[PDB]
Design an enzyme around this catalytic site. Structure first.
Site, PDB file in Angstrom:
ATOM      1  N   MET A 159      -8.427  -5.373  16.313  1.00 26.07           N
ATOM      2  CA  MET A 159      -9.870  -5.317  16.367  1.00 26.07           C
ATOM      3  C   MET A 159     -10.455  -6.615  16.965  1.00 26.07           C
ATOM      4  N   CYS A 181     -13.420   1.375  16.456  1.00 28.32           N
ATOM      5  CA  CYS A 181     -12.008   0.945  16.356  1.00 28.32           C
ATOM      6  C   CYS A 181     -11.256   0.861  17.718  1.00 28.32           C
ATOM      7  N   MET A 182     -11.048   2.024  18.338  1.00 29.49           N
ATOM      8  CA  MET A 182     -10.172   2.090  19.513  1.00 29.49           C
ATOM      9  C   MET A 182     -10.906   2.434  20.781  1.00 29.49           C
ATOM     10  N   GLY A 237      -5.375   1.251  14.597  1.00 28.35           N
ATOM     11  CA  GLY A 237      -5.582   0.921  13.160  1.00 28.35           C
ATOM     12  C   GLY A 237      -5.381   2.111  12.252  1.00 28.35           C
ATOM     13  N   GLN A 238      -5.993   3.254  12.539  1.00 22.50           N
ATOM     14  CA  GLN A 238      -5.921   4.378  11.581  1.00 22.50           C
ATOM     15  C   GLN A 238      -4.640   5.198  11.753  1.00 22.50           C
ATOM     16  N   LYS A 270       0.819  -1.237   0.000  1.00 24.41           N
ATOM     17  CA  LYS A 270       0.000   0.000   0.000  1.00 24.41           C
ATOM     18  C   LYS A 270       0.830   1.253   0.000  1.00 24.41           C
TER      19      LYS A 270
HETATM   20  N1  LIG Z   1      -4.105  -3.779   4.962  1.00 22.88           N
HETATM   21  C1  LIG Z   1      -4.750  -2.996   5.775  1.00 22.88           C
HETATM   22  N2  LIG Z   1      -4.248  -2.708   6.982  1.00 22.88           N
HETATM   23  C2  LIG Z   1      -4.923  -1.917   7.851  1.00 22.88           C
HETATM   24  C3  LIG Z   1      -6.258  -1.457   7.524  1.00 22.88           C
HETATM   25  C4  LIG Z   1      -6.750  -1.764   6.208  1.00 22.88           C
HETATM   26  O1  LIG Z   1      -7.909  -1.380   5.940  1.00 22.88           O
HETATM   27  N3  LIG Z   1      -6.003  -2.573   5.383  1.00 22.88           N
HETATM   28  N4  LIG Z   1      -6.980  -0.681   8.438  1.00 22.88           N
HETATM   29  C5  LIG Z   1      -6.280  -0.312   9.660  1.00 22.88           C
HETATM   30  C6  LIG Z   1      -7.303  -0.293  10.802  1.00 22.88           C
HETATM   31  S1  LIG Z   1      -8.175   1.207  11.051  1.00 22.88           S
HETATM   32  C7  LIG Z   1      -7.441  -1.326  11.724  1.00 22.88           C
HETATM   33  S2  LIG Z   1      -8.590  -1.089  13.001  1.00 22.88           S
HETATM   34  C8  LIG Z   1      -6.594  -2.576  11.689  1.00 22.88           C
HETATM   35  C9  LIG Z   1      -7.392  -3.875  11.761  1.00 22.88           C
HETATM   36  O2  LIG Z   1      -6.337  -4.871  11.978  1.00 22.88           O
HETATM   37  P1  LIG Z   1      -6.777  -6.328  12.477  1.00 22.88           P
HETATM   38  O3  LIG Z   1      -7.715  -6.253  13.618  1.00 22.88           O
HETATM   39  O4  LIG Z   1      -5.475  -7.054  12.663  1.00 22.88           O
HETATM   40  O5  LIG Z   1      -7.502  -6.996  11.194  1.00 22.88           O
HETATM   41  P2  LIG Z   1      -9.008  -7.380  10.768  1.00 22.88           P
HETATM   42  O6  LIG Z   1      -8.859  -7.995   9.398  1.00 22.88           O
HETATM   43  O7  LIG Z   1      -9.854  -6.193  11.037  1.00 22.88           O
HETATM   44  O8  LIG Z   1      -9.503  -8.471  11.893  1.00 22.88           O
HETATM   45  C10 LIG Z   1      -9.195  -9.890  11.700  1.00 22.88           C
HETATM   46  C11 LIG Z   1      -8.780 -10.473  13.070  1.00 22.88           C
HETATM   47  O9  LIG Z   1      -9.895 -10.497  13.941  1.00 22.88           O
HETATM   48  C12 LIG Z   1      -9.620 -11.581  14.840  1.00 22.88           C
HETATM   49  N5  LIG Z   1     -10.766 -11.933  15.672  1.00 22.88           N
HETATM   50  C13 LIG Z   1     -12.078 -12.207  15.142  1.00 22.88           C
HETATM   51  N6  LIG Z   1     -12.813 -12.562  16.238  1.00 22.88           N
HETATM   52  C14 LIG Z   1     -12.026 -12.505  17.368  1.00 22.88           C
HETATM   53  C15 LIG Z   1     -12.209 -12.719  18.813  1.00 22.88           C
HETATM   54  O10 LIG Z   1     -13.300 -13.140  19.218  1.00 22.88           O
HETATM   55  N7  LIG Z   1     -11.163 -12.504  19.602  1.00 22.88           N
HETATM   56  C16 LIG Z   1      -9.974 -12.043  19.155  1.00 22.88           C
HETATM   57  N8  LIG Z   1      -9.062 -11.835  20.058  1.00 22.88           N
HETATM   58  N9  LIG Z   1      -9.693 -11.856  17.860  1.00 22.88           N
HETATM   59  C17 LIG Z   1     -10.746 -11.987  17.031  1.00 22.88           C
HETATM   60  C18 LIG Z   1      -9.257 -12.732  13.925  1.00 22.88           C
HETATM   61  O11 LIG Z   1      -8.447 -13.660  14.682  1.00 22.88           O
HETATM   62  C19 LIG Z   1      -8.514 -11.963  12.808  1.00 22.88           C
HETATM   63  O12 LIG Z   1      -7.066 -12.131  12.897  1.00 22.88           O
HETATM   64  O13 LIG Z   1      -5.903  -2.561  10.446  1.00 22.88           O
HETATM   65  C20 LIG Z   1      -5.244  -1.345  10.151  1.00 22.88           C
HETATM   66  N10 LIG Z   1      -4.343  -1.654   9.057  1.00 22.88           N
HETATM   67  N1  LIG Z   2     -17.588  -5.003   8.681  1.00 25.37           N
HETATM   68  C1  LIG Z   2     -16.579  -4.254   9.182  1.00 25.37           C
HETATM   69  N2  LIG Z   2     -16.747  -2.915   9.230  1.00 25.37           N
HETATM   70  C2  LIG Z   2     -15.803  -2.096   9.754  1.00 25.37           C
HETATM   71  C3  LIG Z   2     -14.516  -2.698  10.233  1.00 25.37           C
HETATM   72  C4  LIG Z   2     -14.390  -4.141  10.195  1.00 25.37           C
HETATM   73  O1  LIG Z   2     -13.312  -4.696  10.598  1.00 25.37           O
HETATM   74  N3  LIG Z   2     -15.457  -4.867   9.668  1.00 25.37           N
HETATM   75  N4  LIG Z   2     -13.529  -1.867  10.727  1.00 25.37           N
HETATM   76  C5  LIG Z   2     -14.077  -0.671  11.404  1.00 25.37           C
HETATM   77  C6  LIG Z   2     -12.903   0.228  11.714  1.00 25.37           C
HETATM   78  S1  LIG Z   2     -11.686  -0.336  12.835  1.00 25.37           S
HETATM   79  C7  LIG Z   2     -12.683   1.415  11.090  1.00 25.37           C
HETATM   80  S2  LIG Z   2     -11.213   2.275  11.399  1.00 25.37           S
HETATM   81  C8  LIG Z   2     -13.690   1.916  10.049  1.00 25.37           C
HETATM   82  C9  LIG Z   2     -12.971   2.567   8.883  1.00 25.37           C
HETATM   83  O2  LIG Z   2     -14.049   3.099   8.040  1.00 25.37           O
HETATM   84  P1  LIG Z   2     -13.938   4.472   7.218  1.00 25.37           P
HETATM   85  O3  LIG Z   2     -12.926   5.383   7.722  1.00 25.37           O
HETATM   86  O4  LIG Z   2     -15.386   4.874   6.996  1.00 25.37           O
HETATM   87  O5  LIG Z   2     -13.332   3.939   5.827  1.00 25.37           O
HETATM   88  P2  LIG Z   2     -12.306   4.698   4.888  1.00 25.37           P
HETATM   89  O6  LIG Z   2     -12.438   3.946   3.565  1.00 25.37           O
HETATM   90  O7  LIG Z   2     -10.917   4.705   5.493  1.00 25.37           O
HETATM   91  O8  LIG Z   2     -12.928   6.144   4.700  1.00 25.37           O
HETATM   92  C10 LIG Z   2     -12.015   7.192   4.453  1.00 25.37           C
HETATM   93  C11 LIG Z   2     -12.688   8.048   3.392  1.00 25.37           C
HETATM   94  O9  LIG Z   2     -11.891   9.269   3.361  1.00 25.37           O
HETATM   95  C12 LIG Z   2     -11.912   9.637   1.988  1.00 25.37           C
HETATM   96  N5  LIG Z   2     -10.836  10.635   1.685  1.00 25.37           N
HETATM   97  C13 LIG Z   2      -9.461  10.383   1.626  1.00 25.37           C
HETATM   98  N6  LIG Z   2      -8.780  11.489   1.990  1.00 25.37           N
HETATM   99  C14 LIG Z   2      -9.647  12.456   2.399  1.00 25.37           C
HETATM  100  C15 LIG Z   2      -9.539  13.783   2.966  1.00 25.37           C
HETATM  101  O10 LIG Z   2      -8.358  14.245   3.263  1.00 25.37           O
HETATM  102  N7  LIG Z   2     -10.733  14.410   3.180  1.00 25.37           N
HETATM  103  C16 LIG Z   2     -11.944  13.810   2.952  1.00 25.37           C
HETATM  104  N8  LIG Z   2     -13.034  14.518   3.279  1.00 25.37           N
HETATM  105  N9  LIG Z   2     -12.113  12.553   2.418  1.00 25.37           N
HETATM  106  C17 LIG Z   2     -10.953  11.900   2.164  1.00 25.37           C
HETATM  107  C18 LIG Z   2     -11.789   8.335   1.213  1.00 25.37           C
HETATM  108  O11 LIG Z   2     -12.137   8.481  -0.175  1.00 25.37           O
HETATM  109  C19 LIG Z   2     -12.785   7.454   1.990  1.00 25.37           C
HETATM  110  O12 LIG Z   2     -14.139   7.551   1.540  1.00 25.37           O
HETATM  111  O13 LIG Z   2     -14.409   0.805   9.524  1.00 25.37           O
HETATM  112  C20 LIG Z   2     -15.131   0.087  10.565  1.00 25.37           C
HETATM  113  N10 LIG Z   2     -16.047  -0.782   9.843  1.00 25.37           N
HETATM  114  S1  SF4 Z   3       2.111   2.729   7.419  1.00 28.29           S
HETATM  115 FE1  SF4 Z   3       1.094   0.811   7.212  1.00 28.29          FE
HETATM  116  S2  SF4 Z   3       0.190   0.934   5.140  1.00 28.29           S
HETATM  117 FE2  SF4 Z   3       1.705   2.482   5.286  1.00 28.29          FE
HETATM  118  S3  SF4 Z   3       3.531   1.511   4.391  1.00 28.29           S
HETATM  119 FE3  SF4 Z   3       3.616   1.315   6.643  1.00 28.29          FE
HETATM  120  S4  SF4 Z   3       2.778  -0.630   7.090  1.00 28.29           S
HETATM  121 FE4  SF4 Z   3       2.141  -0.125   4.932  1.00 28.29          FE
END
Ligand SMILES: Nc1nc2c(c(=O)[nH]1)N[C@H]1C(S)=C(S)[C@@H](COP(=O)(O)OP(=O)(O)OC[C@H]3O[C@@H](n4cnc5c(=O)[nH]c(N)nc54)[C@H](O)[C@@H]3O)O[C@H]1N2
Ligand SMILES: Nc1nc2c(c(=O)[nH]1)N[C@H]1C(S)=C(S)[C@@H](COP(=O)(O)OP(=O)(O)OC[C@H]3O[C@@H](n4cnc5c(=O)[nH]c(N)nc54)[C@H](O)[C@@H]3O)O[C@H]1N2
Ligand code: SF4
Ligand code: HEC
Ligand code: HEC
Ligand code: MOS
Ligand SMILES: [Cl-]
Lengths: 792, 108
Positions: A336, A142-143, A373-374, A46
């Protein structure tokens, strides 16, 4: 010929430093910043495509407003309009709602991808300007459980360890974190430590097998939510094997027992809420003794825990022994899986218990480390306090001293800040559906795709004719498609920014290019809109009578031209970089915002260095005291706030002690049943960010993973008469989506569970998920609910 | 009007037909992997990629043999061991929308 400038990565909370090459207003390359301490030159796939994320062909360049017959209409198709036109209608709509219903009917849904100054400007606009606490962010999803967990155990937010712990740990324990895909560069630091020091152990616990298992020494698949029972088993093990660090425990900890049966954060007429006994005050606890705590966890023995969790006793013991052994430095990591969990605040408390019982905290390698995460869920949402209950620097609206301190810094009349928490994320969708939240502005998120239970709450809430929805974005999204006015926004290095990563490292960047068309930063949009409101329209008369100097002044004057936020003039702007907002308002707005905001944390444990120091460094980790960053908090000799001779001081708590909590296993909100016999887990893949609106417009990242899929165990596919590549519906009692079966992919779930990533806007898996939350943190559990799988 | 090309024409409330799983194509940014990698072992027992790409197919560049301090080692760095964090194959399908990126590659 290129101009190279530093910035943090736009994507995950790892916070890799990049350098960005510009020529002729275009980012032509980026590279991992070799001098940045977090990543030392590496990125993941990424990061390596950051040069393509701003250049999708459909970038928003003009305000779009639904119009019919020459005027705003809810039922109208979008048409382009001017910024003045957009803000006129916004002004009409917000003022109408404020007069008819008051500030509980206006709201904002913000973001941990806001820059620090964006989130601070938005917090002032709503909490001090509109007097509404209905500002909450995507970091609520998220957090929130992690921050509640920190406030309960330590009385102050965010980790006390840092990334340097990855080079010092002897055991890493991933409690559901999928670091290999979701914090790739931190997983590279794990992998380096493990392959270079091979006595090191990597333990990965998960509800499905994924790429982390390619390094694991010990891999544990466990039943969803039964992590609570495993954490107590470890605590029991430590006690029963006489491995409590008794001096640490006596000097530095106390014990509480939390209230139980606290419901699932559903609507109050939901049968689960009616069934619960203690939903009304779900974070209550009582003081107990060590012995009462040992008795409590003694119920979590191998027979109970191995049966409930499906983890063999030999593995529970291998895991518990790493925690217990005083010679093993343990870094526990969670994301998460612990936080998007209907008891995820308890799970956070419970993993801190393991470290507190053993004294394994706040020293190199001995590190209960919550992963964020973010890119700026920490630096922005949490530290600025862009939440419905918050003020900056861990402060809360319910505390009168905290409101006084904000009103002092913000030069407000006593009683300006509302004292009751407003509508959090999940509640905002329910109030939109119920037509009680009627003017609403979404920035830097795609919450129609991202919030659970889209069909029952978010979609009818946005389309409700009683409401007016504004969405700021850089691209078309399903959130913008469900809105009434769409504002084109400047993103990432089109604006000067600050983001704060998972190890408290705040990282700045200059504006390096100019946004296309009439796209403008979220910061510009907030401060520009504040000109449209006079204090007489938004403050009760008794507040103006206490600060009569504000008569007839606008919120722009009160919040942004207040002698503080505007005290740094245009000549302070580094002339080698544009600054569109500085030029627009006539002073160095980002610097004034940052320095006023920084007044909250300086001398109070959250110290940010002077603004200019961050443009000179590759981040600095707070508290920054006398120019020196802090790597380990609460530890004497590492943290300048810790009193001499104490060893450790958890000075977020009045007695300086951390709390160990006795909390039970309780089951999920919704588990499989006869009709819906599979668990649905949702989450991410390495190549896409969140809703895909940025990554899935990059050709290489789209082609790397073009569509979501249903990852499924081969035996479950056989039992359903499915083969790889056939289409199914995934269906819950709430909604349905259609996708293809993958029985041979990178995620390999146990029988009875499927995993579906949420990045594909043509496969809205959040129609299927349940907006049940942890009742304390109000964070949604997207990780488990019940589905059936039916052939198309 | 306004359309999200990542979803396609279907209103949010409805459910589009899923496309087929696309096969992987056979035939400074990390290059994409121009070949299928299905079934290739990449774990701490065996790195299948290193089978053809060791400095011992185009070999990995010497940067891949470097530790965090830029020491060149005699074998691939642990920091580069999991190749697929950075190198990805590509489905044999066109992008959903245009992208106006430019590579330095072509502008100097
Ligand atoms: N590539 C990539 N990286 C990202 C993001 C992205 O969108 N893409 N988003 C960023 C953000 S904002 C976040 S919040 C993180 C998410 O990072 P992660 O939380 O690591 O990833 P996810 O794919 O959301 O969640 C999958 C994990 O949920 C765990 N899980 C499901 N149920 C349970 C449970 O009951 N207990 C426990 N302990 N674990 C459980 C599974 O074991 C699985 O490994 O990633 C961050 N980094
Ligand atoms: N089913 C499921 N749902 C989830 C999760 C999951 O694990 N499972 N993860 C949850 C978690 S941990 C998180 S963090 C959320 C993340 O959910 P969101 O934050 O809603 O997802 P993003 O795609 O990161 O949204 C960012 C947006 O910002 C826009 N954009 C980029 N740069 C800018 C800018 O500078 N200004 C503006 N105005 N727009 C911009 C992008 O086009 C995009 O639409 O999702 C939650 N939802
Ligand atoms: S901050 Fe996260 S998404 Fe960006 S390069 Fe590093 S590990 Fe990859
Ligand atoms: C032999 C049976 C191979 C295996 C195993 C792996 N790769 Fe490969 N790769 C191979 C060939 C013959 C070629 C084409 C010649 C060339 O070098 O391009 C490739 C190509 C790549 C590339 C492109 C390099 C470039 O364009 O500069 C990459 C990034 C690559 N391969 C990576 C890669 C990975 C990560 C592997 C394990 C999953 C892997 N290869 C295995 C031959 C073989
Ligand atoms: C990011 C941290 C990477 C990891 C892990 C791997 N590779 Fe890589 N690779 C990366 C980049 C940014 C580049 C281009 C710049 C460079 O350092 O050379 C590459 C390049 C290659 C190539 C082409 C080599 C050439 O002379 O042009 C190949 C064949 C390649 N990479 C393969 C490869 C293998 C097999 C890996 C796992 C052992 C691997 N890379 C890991 C970034 C990253
Ligand atoms: Mo996910 S912050
Ligand atoms: Cl859909």
């Amino acid at each position: 010929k290129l101009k190279w400038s530093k910035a943090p990565c736009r994507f995950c909370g790892t916070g890799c430093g990049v350098t960005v090459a510009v020529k002729d207003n275009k980012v032509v390359a980026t590279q991992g910043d070799p001098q940045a301490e977090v990543n030392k030159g590496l990125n993941c796939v990424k990061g390596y495509f950051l040069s393509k994320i701003m250049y999708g062909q459909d970038r928003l360049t003009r305000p779009l407003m639904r119009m019919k017959n020459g005027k705003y209409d809810k039922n109208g198709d979008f048409a382009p309009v001017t910024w003045d036109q957009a803000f006129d209608e916004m002004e009409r709509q917000f003022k109408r709602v404020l007069k008819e219903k008051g500030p509980t009917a206006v709201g904002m849904f913000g973001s941990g991808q806001w820059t620090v100054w964006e989130g601070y400007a938005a917090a002032k606009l709503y909490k001090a300007g509109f007097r509404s606490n209905n500002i909450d962010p995507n970091a609520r999803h998220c957090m929130a459980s992690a921050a509640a967990g920190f406030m309960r155990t330590f009385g102050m937010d965010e980790p006390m360890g840092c990334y340097d712990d990855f080079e010092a740990a002897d055991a890493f324990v991933l409690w559901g974190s999928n670091m290999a895909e979701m914090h790739p560069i931190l997983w590279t630091r794990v992998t380096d430590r493990r392959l270079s020091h091979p006595k090191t152990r990597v333990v990965v616990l998960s509800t499905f097998t994924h790429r982390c298992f390619d390094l694991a020494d010990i891999g544990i698949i466990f039943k969803p939510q039964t992590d609570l029972a495993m954490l107590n088993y470890i605590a029991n093990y430590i006690i029963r094997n006489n491995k409590v660090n008794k001096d640490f425990v006596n000097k530095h900890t106390v014990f509480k027992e939390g209230v139980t049966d606290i419901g699932y954060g559903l609507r109050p007429d939901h049968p689960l809420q009616k069934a619960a006994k203690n939903a009304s005050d779900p974070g209550a606890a009582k003081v107990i003794t060590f012995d009462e705590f040992a008795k409590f966890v003694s119920k979590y023995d191998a027979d109970y825990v191995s049966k409930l969790s499906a983890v063999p006793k030999a593995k529970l013991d291998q895991l518990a022994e790493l925690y217990a052994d005083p010679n093993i430095k343990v870094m526990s990591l969670w994301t998460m899986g612990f936080n998007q969990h209907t008891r995820g605040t308890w799970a956070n408390n419970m993993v801190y218990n393991l470290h507190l019982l053993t004294g394994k905290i706040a020293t190199p390698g001995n590190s209960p480390f919550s992963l964020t995460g973010q890119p700026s869920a920490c630096g922005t949402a949490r530290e600025v306090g862009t939440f419905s209950h918050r003020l900056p620097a861990d402060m809360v609206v319910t505390n009168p001293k905290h409101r006084e301190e904000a009103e002092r810094i913000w030069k407000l009349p006593p009683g300006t800040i509302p004292d009751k928490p407003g509508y959090d994320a999940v509640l905002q969708n329910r109030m939109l559906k119920d037509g009680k939240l009627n003017a609403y502005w979404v920035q830097v998120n795609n919450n129609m795709q991202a919030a659970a239970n889209l069909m029952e709450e978010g979609l009818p809430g946005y389309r409700n004719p009683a409401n007016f929805i504004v969405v700021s974005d850089a691209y078309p999204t399903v959130t913008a498609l469900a809105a009434d006015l769409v504002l084109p926004s400047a993103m990432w290095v089109e604006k000067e920014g600050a983001y704060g990563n998972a190890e408290r490292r705040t990282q700045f960047w200059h504006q390096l290019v100019d946004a296309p068309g009439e796209a403008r930063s979220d910061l510009w949009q907030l401060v520009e809109f504040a000109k449209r409101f006079k204090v007489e329209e938004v403050w009760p008369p008794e507040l103006i009578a206490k600060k009569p100097e504000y008569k007839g002044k606008t919120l722009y004057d009160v919040l942004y031209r207040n002698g503080q936020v505007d005290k740094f003039p245009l000549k302070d702007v580094n002339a080698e970089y544009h600054n569109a907002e500085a030029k627009a308002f006539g002073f160095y707005l980002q610097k004034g915002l940052f320095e006023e905001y920084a007044t909250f944390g300086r001398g109070h444990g959250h110290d940010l260095a002077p603004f200019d120091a961050y443009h000179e460094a590759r981040g600095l980790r707070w508290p920054v005291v006398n120019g020196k960053e802090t790597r380990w908090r609460y530890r004497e000799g590492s943290d300048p706030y810790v009193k001499a001779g104490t060893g450790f001081q958890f000075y977020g708590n009045p007695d300086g002690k951390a709390v160990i909590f006795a909390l039970p296993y309780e089951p999920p909100a919704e588990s499989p049943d006869k009709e819906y016999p599979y668990w649905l887990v949702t989450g991410r893949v390495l190549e896409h960010w969140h809703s895909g609106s940025m990554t899935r417009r990059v050709p290489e990242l789209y082609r790397s993973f073009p569509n979501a899929v249903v990852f499924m165990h081969p035996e479950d596919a056989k039992a359903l008469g499915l083969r790889r590549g056939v289409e199914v519906e995934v269906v819950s009692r709430r909604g349905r989506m259609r996708s293809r079966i993958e029985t041979r992919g990178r995620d390999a779930p146990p029988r009875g569970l499927v995993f579906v990533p949420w990045f594909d806007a043509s496969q809205l898996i959040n129609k299927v998920t349940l907006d049940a939350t942890c009742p304390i943190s109000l964070q949604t559990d997207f990780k488990k609910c019940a589905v059936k799988i039916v052939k198309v | 009007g306004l359309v999200d090309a990542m979803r396609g024409p279907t209103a949010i409330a409805n459910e589009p037909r899923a496309p087929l799983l696309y096969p992987t194509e056979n035939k400074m940014q990390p290059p994409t992997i121009p070949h299928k990698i299905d079934g290739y072992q990449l774990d701490k027992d065996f790195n299948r990629c290193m089978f053809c790409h060791a400095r011992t197919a185009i070999p990995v560049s010497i940067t891949h043999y470097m530790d965090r301090d830029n020491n060149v080692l005699a074998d691939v760095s642990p920091r580069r061991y999991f190749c697929t964090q950075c190198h990805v194959p590509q489905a044999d399908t066109k992008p959903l929308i245009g992208n106006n990126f430019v590579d330095v590659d072509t502008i100097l």
